[PDB]
Amino acid sequence: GSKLEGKTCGPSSFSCPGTHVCVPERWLCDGDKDCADGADESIAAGCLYNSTGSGSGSGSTEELRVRLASHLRKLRKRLL
Ligand SMILES: [Ca+2]
């Protein structure tokens, strides 16, 4: 979609609405509309707020779904 260099949709992931592409759950509330319409950061993906709070909002739960994946999705792809 946007900054997606070929991710997966198996584990904690989210299918970028409108595009066959699938953005990881960690990318959701990462703070950057990776999807075509920021669906990844939007609530449609499960950000529990969409934008509001950048990388959080409702509470720890928001980071619980994102952070938990920050050790693989973002800490294991093909950039570093
Ligand atoms: Ca993203």
mmCIF file of N, CA and C and ligand atoms in Angstrom:
data_model
loop_
_atom_site.group_PDB
_atom_site.id
_atom_site.type_symbol
_atom_site.label_atom_id
_atom_site.label_comp_id
_atom_site.label_asym_id
_atom_site.label_seq_id
_atom_site.Cartn_x
_atom_site.Cartn_y
_atom_site.Cartn_z
ATOM 1 N N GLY A 1 0.827 -1.240 0.000
ATOM 2 C CA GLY A 1 0.000 0.000 0.000
ATOM 3 C C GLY A 1 0.841 1.261 0.000
ATOM 4 N N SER A 2 1.244 1.701 1.188
ATOM 5 C CA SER A 2 2.057 2.904 1.321
ATOM 6 C C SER A 2 3.519 2.548 1.583
ATOM 7 N N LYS A 3 3.836 2.239 2.837
ATOM 8 C CA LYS A 3 5.198 1.880 3.214
ATOM 9 C C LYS A 3 5.335 0.371 3.391
ATOM 10 N N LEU A 4 4.437 -0.380 2.762
ATOM 11 C CA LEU A 4 4.461 -1.834 2.853
ATOM 12 C C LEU A 4 5.371 -2.426 1.781
ATOM 13 N N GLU A 5 6.451 -3.066 2.215
ATOM 14 C CA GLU A 5 7.401 -3.674 1.289
ATOM 15 C C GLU A 5 7.187 -5.181 1.198
ATOM 16 N N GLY A 6 5.926 -5.597 1.236
ATOM 17 C CA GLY A 6 5.610 -7.009 1.154
ATOM 18 C C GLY A 6 5.522 -7.667 2.514
ATOM 19 N N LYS A 7 4.464 -7.355 3.253
ATOM 20 C CA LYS A 7 4.266 -7.926 4.579
ATOM 21 C C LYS A 7 3.428 -9.198 4.500
ATOM 22 N N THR A 8 2.984 -9.681 5.655
ATOM 23 C CA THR A 8 2.173 -10.890 5.714
ATOM 24 C C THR A 8 0.832 -10.613 6.384
ATOM 25 N N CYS A 9 -0.037 -11.618 6.395
ATOM 26 C CA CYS A 9 -1.357 -11.477 7.003
ATOM 27 C C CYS A 9 -1.667 -12.652 7.931
ATOM 28 N N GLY A 10 -0.670 -13.497 8.183
ATOM 29 C CA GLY A 10 -0.872 -14.643 9.053
ATOM 30 C C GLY A 10 -1.156 -14.240 10.487
ATOM 31 N N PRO A 11 -0.114 -14.128 11.331
ATOM 32 C CA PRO A 11 -0.270 -13.745 12.740
ATOM 33 C C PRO A 11 -0.984 -12.405 12.900
ATOM 34 N N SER A 12 -0.709 -11.714 14.005
ATOM 35 C CA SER A 12 -1.324 -10.417 14.277
ATOM 36 C C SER A 12 -1.188 -9.481 13.079
ATOM 37 N N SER A 13 -2.167 -9.530 12.180
ATOM 38 C CA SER A 13 -2.153 -8.689 10.991
ATOM 39 C C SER A 13 -3.541 -8.135 10.687
ATOM 40 N N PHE A 14 -3.608 -7.271 9.682
ATOM 41 C CA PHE A 14 -4.864 -6.654 9.274
ATOM 42 C C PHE A 14 -4.872 -6.412 7.766
ATOM 43 N N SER A 15 -5.895 -6.918 7.088
ATOM 44 C CA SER A 15 -6.006 -6.746 5.645
ATOM 45 C C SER A 15 -6.349 -5.300 5.301
ATOM 46 N N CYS A 16 -5.413 -4.606 4.656
ATOM 47 C CA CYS A 16 -5.621 -3.213 4.277
ATOM 48 C C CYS A 16 -6.894 -3.062 3.444
ATOM 49 N N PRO A 17 -7.945 -2.465 4.031
ATOM 50 C CA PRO A 17 -9.229 -2.261 3.350
ATOM 51 C C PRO A 17 -9.073 -1.568 2.001
ATOM 52 N N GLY A 18 -9.685 -2.147 0.972
ATOM 53 C CA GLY A 18 -9.605 -1.573 -0.358
ATOM 54 C C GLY A 18 -8.464 -2.149 -1.174
ATOM 55 N N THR A 19 -7.462 -2.691 -0.489
ATOM 56 C CA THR A 19 -6.306 -3.273 -1.159
ATOM 57 C C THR A 19 -6.051 -4.696 -0.675
ATOM 58 N N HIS A 20 -5.706 -5.578 -1.607
ATOM 59 C CA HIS A 20 -5.425 -6.972 -1.280
ATOM 60 C C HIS A 20 -4.312 -7.074 -0.241
ATOM 61 N N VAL A 21 -3.505 -6.022 -0.143
ATOM 62 C CA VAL A 21 -2.399 -5.984 0.802
ATOM 63 C C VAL A 21 -2.884 -6.179 2.236
ATOM 64 N N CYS A 22 -1.995 -6.679 3.090
ATOM 65 C CA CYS A 22 -2.324 -6.913 4.492
ATOM 66 C C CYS A 22 -1.274 -6.287 5.405
ATOM 67 N N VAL A 23 -1.695 -5.294 6.181
ATOM 68 C CA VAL A 23 -0.798 -4.601 7.098
ATOM 69 C C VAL A 23 -0.840 -5.219 8.498
ATOM 70 N N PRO A 24 0.336 -5.492 9.093
ATOM 71 C CA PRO A 24 0.431 -6.083 10.434
ATOM 72 C C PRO A 24 -0.279 -5.254 11.497
ATOM 73 N N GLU A 25 -0.673 -5.912 12.581
ATOM 74 C CA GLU A 25 -1.353 -5.238 13.679
ATOM 75 C C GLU A 25 -0.433 -4.219 14.343
ATOM 76 N N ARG A 26 0.863 -4.501 14.334
ATOM 77 C CA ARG A 26 1.838 -3.596 14.930
ATOM 78 C C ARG A 26 1.875 -2.279 14.170
ATOM 79 N N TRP A 27 1.636 -2.364 12.871
ATOM 80 C CA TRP A 27 1.650 -1.193 12.015
ATOM 81 C C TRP A 27 0.377 -0.372 12.201
ATOM 82 N N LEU A 28 -0.707 -1.040 12.597
ATOM 83 C CA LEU A 28 -1.993 -0.377 12.818
ATOM 84 C C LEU A 28 -1.826 0.985 13.483
ATOM 85 N N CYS A 29 -1.608 0.979 14.790
ATOM 86 C CA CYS A 29 -1.446 2.217 15.540
ATOM 87 C C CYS A 29 0.019 2.628 15.648
ATOM 88 N N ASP A 30 0.794 2.360 14.603
ATOM 89 C CA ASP A 30 2.202 2.730 14.597
ATOM 90 C C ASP A 30 2.345 4.240 14.426
ATOM 91 N N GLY A 31 1.327 4.856 13.826
ATOM 92 C CA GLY A 31 1.341 6.288 13.614
ATOM 93 C C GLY A 31 1.674 6.669 12.185
ATOM 94 N N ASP A 32 1.131 5.924 11.228
ATOM 95 C CA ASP A 32 1.383 6.200 9.817
ATOM 96 C C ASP A 32 0.445 5.397 8.922
ATOM 97 N N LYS A 33 -0.494 6.086 8.282
ATOM 98 C CA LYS A 33 -1.453 5.432 7.399
ATOM 99 C C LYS A 33 -0.752 4.613 6.323
ATOM 100 N N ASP A 34 -0.528 3.337 6.621
ATOM 101 C CA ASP A 34 0.127 2.436 5.683
ATOM 102 C C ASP A 34 -0.848 1.994 4.599
ATOM 103 N N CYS A 35 -2.119 1.876 4.970
ATOM 104 C CA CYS A 35 -3.152 1.467 4.031
ATOM 105 C C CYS A 35 -3.432 2.580 3.032
ATOM 106 N N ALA A 36 -4.422 2.359 2.177
ATOM 107 C CA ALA A 36 -4.795 3.342 1.175
ATOM 108 C C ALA A 36 -5.546 4.509 1.807
ATOM 109 N N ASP A 37 -6.282 4.223 2.878
ATOM 110 C CA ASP A 37 -7.052 5.250 3.572
ATOM 111 C C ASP A 37 -6.746 5.261 5.069
ATOM 112 N N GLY A 38 -5.510 4.925 5.428
ATOM 113 C CA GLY A 38 -5.127 4.911 6.830
ATOM 114 C C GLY A 38 -5.955 3.950 7.653
ATOM 115 N N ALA A 39 -6.569 2.978 6.990
ATOM 116 C CA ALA A 39 -7.387 1.987 7.675
ATOM 117 C C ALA A 39 -6.586 1.288 8.766
ATOM 118 N N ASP A 40 -5.301 1.078 8.497
ATOM 119 C CA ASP A 40 -4.413 0.428 9.451
ATOM 120 C C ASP A 40 -4.367 1.222 10.757
ATOM 121 N N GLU A 41 -4.308 2.546 10.645
ATOM 122 C CA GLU A 41 -4.286 3.407 11.828
ATOM 123 C C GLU A 41 -5.705 3.731 12.279
ATOM 124 N N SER A 42 -6.669 3.534 11.384
ATOM 125 C CA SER A 42 -8.064 3.801 11.699
ATOM 126 C C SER A 42 -8.617 2.741 12.638
ATOM 127 N N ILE A 43 -9.866 2.918 13.044
ATOM 128 C CA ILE A 43 -10.515 1.975 13.938
ATOM 129 C C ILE A 43 -10.940 0.723 13.180
ATOM 130 N N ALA A 44 -11.130 0.869 11.870
ATOM 131 C CA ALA A 44 -11.519 -0.252 11.023
ATOM 132 C C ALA A 44 -10.574 -1.431 11.229
ATOM 133 N N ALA A 45 -9.334 -1.117 11.593
ATOM 134 C CA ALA A 45 -8.320 -2.132 11.835
ATOM 135 C C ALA A 45 -8.342 -2.581 13.291
ATOM 136 N N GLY A 46 -8.840 -1.708 14.160
ATOM 137 C CA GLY A 46 -8.909 -2.021 15.571
ATOM 138 C C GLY A 46 -7.957 -1.179 16.395
ATOM 139 N N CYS A 47 -7.779 0.076 15.991
ATOM 140 C CA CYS A 47 -6.892 0.985 16.710
ATOM 141 C C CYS A 47 -7.563 1.506 17.983
ATOM 142 N N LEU A 48 -8.846 1.186 18.143
ATOM 143 C CA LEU A 48 -9.611 1.585 19.322
ATOM 144 C C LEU A 48 -9.762 3.098 19.449
ATOM 145 N N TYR A 49 -9.537 3.836 18.366
ATOM 146 C CA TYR A 49 -9.671 5.290 18.422
ATOM 147 C C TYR A 49 -9.435 5.948 17.067
ATOM 148 N N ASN A 50 -8.508 5.401 16.290
ATOM 149 C CA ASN A 50 -8.196 5.950 14.975
ATOM 150 C C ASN A 50 -7.531 7.318 15.087
ATOM 151 N N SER A 51 -6.233 7.359 14.801
ATOM 152 C CA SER A 51 -5.468 8.602 14.846
ATOM 153 C C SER A 51 -5.330 9.138 16.269
ATOM 154 N N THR A 52 -6.453 9.557 16.851
ATOM 155 C CA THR A 52 -6.470 10.111 18.206
ATOM 156 C C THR A 52 -5.540 9.350 19.149
ATOM 157 N N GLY A 53 -4.473 10.018 19.580
ATOM 158 C CA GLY A 53 -3.521 9.398 20.484
ATOM 159 C C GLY A 53 -2.286 8.866 19.775
ATOM 160 N N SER A 54 -2.190 9.122 18.471
ATOM 161 C CA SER A 54 -1.052 8.669 17.674
ATOM 162 C C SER A 54 -0.793 7.171 17.866
ATOM 163 N N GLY A 55 0.018 6.826 18.864
ATOM 164 C CA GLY A 55 0.323 5.430 19.122
ATOM 165 C C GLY A 55 -0.394 4.897 20.347
ATOM 166 N N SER A 56 -1.561 5.463 20.636
ATOM 167 C CA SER A 56 -2.352 5.046 21.787
ATOM 168 C C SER A 56 -3.678 5.797 21.825
ATOM 169 N N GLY A 57 -4.361 5.739 22.963
ATOM 170 C CA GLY A 57 -5.632 6.426 23.095
ATOM 171 C C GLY A 57 -6.481 5.877 24.223
ATOM 172 N N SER A 58 -7.208 4.799 23.944
ATOM 173 C CA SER A 58 -8.071 4.181 24.944
ATOM 174 C C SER A 58 -7.282 3.811 26.199
ATOM 175 N N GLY A 59 -6.069 3.300 26.003
ATOM 176 C CA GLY A 59 -5.239 2.916 27.131
ATOM 177 C C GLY A 59 -4.161 1.917 26.754
ATOM 178 N N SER A 60 -3.627 1.221 27.757
ATOM 179 C CA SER A 60 -2.581 0.229 27.532
ATOM 180 C C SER A 60 -3.028 -0.822 26.524
ATOM 181 N N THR A 61 -4.310 -1.175 26.572
ATOM 182 C CA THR A 61 -4.866 -2.169 25.660
ATOM 183 C C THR A 61 -4.468 -1.869 24.219
ATOM 184 N N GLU A 62 -4.495 -0.591 23.865
ATOM 185 C CA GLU A 62 -4.142 -0.158 22.520
ATOM 186 C C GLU A 62 -2.705 -0.541 22.188
ATOM 187 N N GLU A 63 -1.814 -0.365 23.153
ATOM 188 C CA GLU A 63 -0.410 -0.709 22.962
ATOM 189 C C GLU A 63 -0.207 -2.209 23.129
ATOM 190 N N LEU A 64 -1.100 -2.837 23.884
ATOM 191 C CA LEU A 64 -1.029 -4.270 24.127
ATOM 192 C C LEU A 64 -1.134 -5.050 22.819
ATOM 193 N N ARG A 65 -1.991 -4.577 21.920
ATOM 194 C CA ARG A 65 -2.189 -5.234 20.632
ATOM 195 C C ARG A 65 -1.098 -4.839 19.642
ATOM 196 N N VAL A 66 -0.599 -3.615 19.775
ATOM 197 C CA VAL A 66 0.444 -3.116 18.887
ATOM 198 C C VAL A 66 1.835 -3.490 19.398
ATOM 199 N N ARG A 67 2.193 -2.966 20.564
ATOM 200 C CA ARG A 67 3.498 -3.231 21.171
ATOM 201 C C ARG A 67 3.874 -4.713 21.111
ATOM 202 N N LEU A 68 2.973 -5.574 21.572
ATOM 203 C CA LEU A 68 3.219 -7.016 21.591
ATOM 204 C C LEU A 68 3.775 -7.527 20.260
ATOM 205 N N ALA A 69 3.435 -6.857 19.169
ATOM 206 C CA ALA A 69 3.903 -7.273 17.850
ATOM 207 C C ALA A 69 5.133 -6.487 17.400
ATOM 208 N N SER A 70 5.525 -5.486 18.183
ATOM 209 C CA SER A 70 6.673 -4.648 17.842
ATOM 210 C C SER A 70 7.996 -5.409 17.923
ATOM 211 N N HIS A 71 7.960 -6.652 18.395
ATOM 212 C CA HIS A 71 9.180 -7.451 18.490
ATOM 213 C C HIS A 71 9.345 -8.349 17.264
ATOM 214 N N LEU A 72 8.373 -8.312 16.354
ATOM 215 C CA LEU A 72 8.435 -9.129 15.148
ATOM 216 C C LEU A 72 8.029 -8.334 13.910
ATOM 217 N N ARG A 73 6.754 -7.963 13.841
ATOM 218 C CA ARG A 73 6.228 -7.215 12.699
ATOM 219 C C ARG A 73 7.160 -6.073 12.294
ATOM 220 N N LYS A 74 7.532 -5.238 13.260
ATOM 221 C CA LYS A 74 8.416 -4.107 12.989
ATOM 222 C C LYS A 74 9.872 -4.463 13.275
ATOM 223 N N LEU A 75 10.081 -5.387 14.206
ATOM 224 C CA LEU A 75 11.429 -5.811 14.570
ATOM 225 C C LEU A 75 11.833 -7.075 13.813
ATOM 226 N N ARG A 76 11.203 -7.302 12.663
ATOM 227 C CA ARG A 76 11.498 -8.473 11.847
ATOM 228 C C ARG A 76 10.719 -8.436 10.536
ATOM 229 N N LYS A 77 11.312 -7.823 9.518
ATOM 230 C CA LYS A 77 10.674 -7.724 8.211
ATOM 231 C C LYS A 77 11.702 -7.873 7.088
ATOM 232 N N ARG A 78 12.356 -6.771 6.718
ATOM 233 C CA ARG A 78 13.364 -6.793 5.662
ATOM 234 C C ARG A 78 13.908 -5.390 5.402
ATOM 235 N N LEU A 79 14.106 -4.629 6.473
ATOM 236 C CA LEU A 79 14.620 -3.269 6.359
ATOM 237 C C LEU A 79 15.972 -3.137 7.053
ATOM 238 N N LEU A 80 16.030 -3.568 8.308
ATOM 239 C CA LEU A 80 17.262 -3.499 9.083
ATOM 240 C C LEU A 80 18.375 -4.295 8.410
HETATM 241 CA CA CA B 1 1.050 1.702 9.584
#
